[PDB]
């Protein structure tokens, strides 16, 4: 086997890199990201983005990749706790109290 290993170990070293892709913790982050591409393309399939619109794209990709590498985290369950999120999104605040 050793009368040829000069050239093959060159090429073999390149192939191992293909398997050195990082392992994942949170496959959900992969699903979110794959969903983001399909929205990323539609809104900007006919035209090109602006600068600020372009940061909003690339930065989401950078942050979701971490979740792919970072462990899954605790998650909310309660209905009241859910509604506070929508209020935190929709800029509404509990004024009546």
């Amino acid at each position: 086997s050793e009368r040829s290993k000069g050239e093959a170990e060159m090429q073999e070293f390149l192939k191992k890199k293909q398997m050195e892709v990082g392992k994942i913790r949170n496959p959900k982050a992969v699903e979110k990201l794959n969903a983001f591409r399909i929205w990323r393309e539609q809104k900007y399939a006919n035209r090109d983005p602006t600068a600020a619109e372009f940061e909003q794209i690339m930065k989401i990709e950078g942050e979701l990749i971490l979740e792919s590498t970072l462990a899954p985290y605790g998650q909310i369950e309660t209905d009241k706790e859910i509604e506070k999120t929508y209020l935190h999104l929709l800029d509404i605040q509990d004024f009546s109290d």
Partner: peptide
């Protein structure tokens, strides 16, 4: 799973 994403975005001002 998505609301938590959109929440974390609005924290980042993204």
């Amino acid at each position: 799973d998505m609301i938590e994403e959109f929440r974390n975005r609005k924290i980042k001002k993204i």
